[PDB]
Design a protein around this ligand. Sequence first.
Ligand code: 1O4
Ligand code: 1O4
Ligand code: 1O4
Ligand code: 1O4
Lengths: 134, 134, 134, 134
Amino acid sequence: EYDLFISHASEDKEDFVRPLAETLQQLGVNVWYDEFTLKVGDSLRQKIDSGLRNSKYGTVVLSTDFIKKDWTNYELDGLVAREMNGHKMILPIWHKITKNDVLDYSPNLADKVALNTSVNSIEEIAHQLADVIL
Amino acid sequence: EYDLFISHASEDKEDFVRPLAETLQQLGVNVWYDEFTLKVGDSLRQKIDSGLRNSKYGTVVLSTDFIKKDWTNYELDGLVAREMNGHKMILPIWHKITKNDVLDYSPNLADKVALNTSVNSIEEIAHQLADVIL
Amino acid sequence: EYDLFISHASEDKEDFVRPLAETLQQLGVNVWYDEFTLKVGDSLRQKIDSGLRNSKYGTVVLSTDFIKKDWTNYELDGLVAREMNGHKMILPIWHKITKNDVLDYSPNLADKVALNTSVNSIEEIAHQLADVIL
Amino acid sequence: EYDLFISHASEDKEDFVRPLAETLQQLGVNVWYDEFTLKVGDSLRQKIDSGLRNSKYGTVVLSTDFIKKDWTNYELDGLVAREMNGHKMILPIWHKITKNDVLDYSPNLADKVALNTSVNSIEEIAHQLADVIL
Ligand SMILES: Nc1cccc2cc[n+]([C@@H]3O[C@H](COP(=O)(O)OP(=O)(O)OC[C@H]4O[C@@H](n5cnc6c(N)ncnc65)[C@H](O)[C@@H]4O)[C@@H](O)[C@H]3O)cc12
Ligand SMILES: Nc1cccc2cc[n+]([C@@H]3O[C@H](COP(=O)(O)OP(=O)(O)OC[C@H]4O[C@@H](n5cnc6c(N)ncnc65)[C@H](O)[C@@H]4O)[C@@H](O)[C@H]3O)cc12
Ligand SMILES: Nc1cccc2cc[n+]([C@@H]3O[C@H](COP(=O)(O)OP(=O)(O)OC[C@H]4O[C@@H](n5cnc6c(N)ncnc65)[C@H](O)[C@@H]4O)[C@@H](O)[C@H]3O)cc12
Ligand SMILES: Nc1cccc2cc[n+]([C@@H]3O[C@H](COP(=O)(O)OP(=O)(O)OC[C@H]4O[C@@H](n5cnc6c(N)ncnc65)[C@H](O)[C@@H]4O)[C@@H](O)[C@H]3O)cc12
């Protein structure tokens, strides 16, 4: 069902991630985003697990807060596991972070071409993503 | 697939290399150029290695910045390795650099005939390259 | 902490890599090897990433099975990313493989001097490595 | 640093070139020889280029196998390039080869005085070289 899963830290919602998800839907991507999918009484574990398993692609918004928190590391551990079984997925974004900070977090992600929010705007990034997914 | 691989420093894009690559495609050469080929989520290592291995020829834009940087030296190591197995490839260009500076970088490249950007224009250089490749 | 990280395919453990790692420790190199470090309940992603980032050197056992598999290519991407930031690391070994097969995998590794297991024995290779590391 | 660079084919190591290089060091010449300088993980291109550029003199062992191979012709290109900038270097040796075979390879080397291994012994040749270098 879903085309893209969005993994992000809650400190980045208002200035970046909410505008991004809203514009991707307007282009026509079917997106998994937590404010759209999770409802009262749902199991967090079981809903996240089935969202990770049923998405064609996943995007990760790398940030200083992303590195520290628990649920963000839970999601990225699951994306790499599915990619090491033969299915390529990960589309990275760099937000307020430099190459050296990424290379100190993991040197394998420093090998992957990312979109940098200090160089591209929100809609300029959204157009780049939809060209791969669609 | 590709006819030519272009190896250059990013400081030289706007005043020389972007005009050159645009005019080569208009003559009909099938060219490997990083702004045309690399996309979000690609592995840099694995895409560059298959570009080097599947091209008939390679051109190197010698420059004061080309000498210092890392990825430029990575690409030239791979071109010489394939040439020392019996397949001639390299077509050199000298940009803002003199014979002495080239001879201090490597005396073997000082033996190979090159196109000098202080003597020829962009389209005059492009016409010279296509006569060898095509 | 670690002096050397060993990257290898699991098909090569018993006739080559297990004897090699055992003899390197006896010479006194502090080595990262998966049978010594990984334990029940560890995250594979997070433990491999910190092993790559905290080692002075890395060795890669090039082999016909190494080229095909997923986790072997994951590790080599991270080594090259750290080397293209200015820190030299890679010490290559050729096992049951010829120059032509290496040049068809990547022409840049064909430029780097390697130890060939058809020419040198296990302890003769181990002595060569420790002279660089120590 | 280096006084002499030795350029030779690997088919000639055991019966001529290893004894020669060992006796030159005993006289006190500082020599560039591949078995003494190159180590695991070195770039072949970048180490050879800095050896050619930092030596006062160069010697070439002309032989039937020398003429055919690739890396032997690579080194002689760089020596002539530096000599055509005004710095005399080349000290030739003829091994199992006649004047006619040299003249068919290049008529300019047939003009330079050479040492012939059918007329002089190893130590008799080594004494002749050191009188020029030292
Ligand atoms: N939508 C969501 C609702 C609830 C929990 C979520 C956890 C994670 N996520 C997923 O993970 C990324 C965010 O990681 P995160 O690390 O930013 O999240 P936090 O841990 O900060 O939690 C955020 C806030 O939920 C409050 N809280 C904690 N347990 C609670 C509970 N049972 N009932 C009510 N409220 C609770 C907690 O008090 C804080 O105010 C996203 O991509 C997303 O897919 C989304 C969540
Ligand atoms: N197109 C390209 C994109 C990304 C990296 C490239 C590296 C090399 N090349 C190849 O090598 C020659 C240029 O050498 P170069 O030495 O000029 O390049 P730089 O190292 O300066 O990198 C240039 C910029 O990429 C930024 N950067 C670094 N890692 C990044 C990452 N994972 N995701 C996003 N951005 C990243 C880095 O912040 C800088 O602003 C060309 O012929 C070409 O074929 C092309 C590249
Ligand atoms: N030590 C190790 C344990 C587990 C997984 C590893 C993966 C990779 N490595 C690293 O990568 C190189 C080897 O690449 P490799 O490609 O040889 O490995 P394989 O994919 O063949 O996995 C080998 C076996 O683990 C079984 N398996 C898969 N997921 C499993 C899981 N969660 N729990 C239990 N067992 C699992 C899988 O069934 C097969 O029998 C080494 O340098 C090393 O640093 C080492 C591993
Ligand atoms: N010391 C040396 C080591 C390696 C390569 C050299 C190349 C050239 N040289 C220089 O050139 C003259 C000799 O020309 P040459 O033409 O005699 O040499 P070959 O091409 O026959 O190579 C000889 C052997 O290296 C094996 N081979 C090829 N690539 C390899 C690689 N990455 N890692 C491991 N082994 C590799 C290849 O399998 C063969 O067995 C000398 O004056 C010297 O300064 C010296 C070399």
